[PDB]
Write a protein that holds these residues in place. Structure first.
Motif, mmCIF file in Angstrom:
data_model
loop_
_atom_site.group_PDB
_atom_site.id
_atom_site.type_symbol
_atom_site.label_atom_id
_atom_site.label_comp_id
_atom_site.label_asym_id
_atom_site.label_seq_id
_atom_site.Cartn_x
_atom_site.Cartn_y
_atom_site.Cartn_z
ATOM 1 N N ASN A 1 17.477 -13.080 -2.850
ATOM 2 C CA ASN A 1 17.239 -12.127 -1.770
ATOM 3 C C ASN A 1 16.964 -10.734 -2.325
ATOM 4 N N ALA A 2 16.396 -10.683 -3.526
ATOM 5 C CA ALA A 2 16.077 -9.414 -4.167
ATOM 6 C C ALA A 2 14.600 -9.070 -4.000
ATOM 7 N N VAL A 3 14.307 -7.778 -3.889
ATOM 8 C CA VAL A 3 12.933 -7.318 -3.726
ATOM 9 C C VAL A 3 12.625 -6.162 -4.670
ATOM 10 N N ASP A 4 11.396 -6.128 -5.174
ATOM 11 C CA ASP A 4 10.974 -5.074 -6.088
ATOM 12 C C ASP A 4 9.567 -4.591 -5.748
ATOM 13 N N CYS A 5 9.458 -3.320 -5.375
ATOM 14 C CA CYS A 5 8.171 -2.734 -5.021
ATOM 15 C C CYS A 5 7.621 -1.895 -6.171
ATOM 16 N N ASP A 6 6.327 -2.038 -6.434
ATOM 17 C CA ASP A 6 5.678 -1.293 -7.507
ATOM 18 C C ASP A 6 6.012 0.193 -7.414
ATOM 19 N N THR B 1 0.824 -1.202 0.000
ATOM 20 C CA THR B 1 0.000 0.000 0.000
ATOM 21 C C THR B 1 0.862 1.258 0.000
ATOM 22 N N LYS B 2 0.331 2.334 -0.571
ATOM 23 C CA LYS B 2 1.051 3.600 -0.635
ATOM 24 C C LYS B 2 1.023 4.311 0.713
ATOM 25 N N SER B 3 0.023 3.987 1.528
ATOM 26 C CA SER B 3 -0.119 4.596 2.844
ATOM 27 C C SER B 3 0.778 3.900 3.865
ATOM 28 N N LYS B 4 0.742 2.573 3.865
ATOM 29 C CA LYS B 4 1.551 1.785 4.789
ATOM 30 C C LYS B 4 2.925 1.493 4.196
ATOM 31 N N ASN B 5 3.055 1.696 2.888
ATOM 32 C CA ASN B 5 4.319 1.455 2.200
ATOM 33 C C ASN B 5 4.893 0.093 2.576
ATOM 34 N N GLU B 6 4.008 -0.871 2.814
ATOM 35 C CA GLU B 6 4.428 -2.217 3.184
ATOM 36 C C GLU B 6 3.758 -3.260 2.292
ATOM 37 N N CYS B 7 4.538 -4.241 1.851
ATOM 38 C CA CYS B 7 4.022 -5.299 0.991
ATOM 39 C C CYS B 7 3.652 -6.533 1.809
ATOM 40 N N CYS C 1 4.340 -6.306 -5.672
ATOM 41 C CA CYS C 1 5.787 -6.347 -5.501
ATOM 42 C C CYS C 1 6.323 -7.755 -5.741
ATOM 43 N N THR C 2 7.643 -7.902 -5.662
ATOM 44 C CA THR C 2 8.281 -9.196 -5.872
ATOM 45 C C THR C 2 9.360 -9.451 -4.825
ATOM 46 N N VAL C 3 9.499 -10.711 -4.422
ATOM 47 C CA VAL C 3 10.497 -11.089 -3.427
ATOM 48 C C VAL C 3 11.029 -12.493 -3.687
ATOM 49 N N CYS D 1 8.396 -1.838 2.515
ATOM 50 C CA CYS D 1 8.974 -1.601 1.198
ATOM 51 C C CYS D 1 10.001 -0.474 1.249
ATOM 52 N N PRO D 2 10.866 -0.414 0.224
ATOM 53 C CA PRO D 2 11.910 0.610 0.128
ATOM 54 C C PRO D 2 11.339 1.997 -0.144
#
Length: 55
Positions: free
Chosen positions: A50-55, A8-14, A43-45, A28-29
């Motif tokens: 050990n790579a992560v990608d946030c929308d 979420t854009k508010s919680k910035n957490e995936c 997102c992707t994990v 998220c970053p």
């Protein structure tokens, strides 16, 4: 080794589900390179790279 999660854009957490079947939520970053702009984003994990990608 590919897990799909939504953030979420508010919680910035995936949040994604692992092999355990349980729902895991991770922050998220805040970098301009990767972050949450809209809610219910995606997102992707990977545990292998050990790579992560946030929308």
């Amino acid at each position: 080794a590919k897990y799909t999660g939504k953030c979420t854009k508010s919680k910035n957490e995936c949040k994604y589900k692992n092999d355990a079947g349980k729902d895991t939520f991770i922050k998220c970053p805040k970098f301009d390179n990767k972050k949450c702009t809209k809610d219910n984003n995606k997102c992707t994990v990977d545990t292998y790279n050990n790579a992560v990608d946030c929308d």
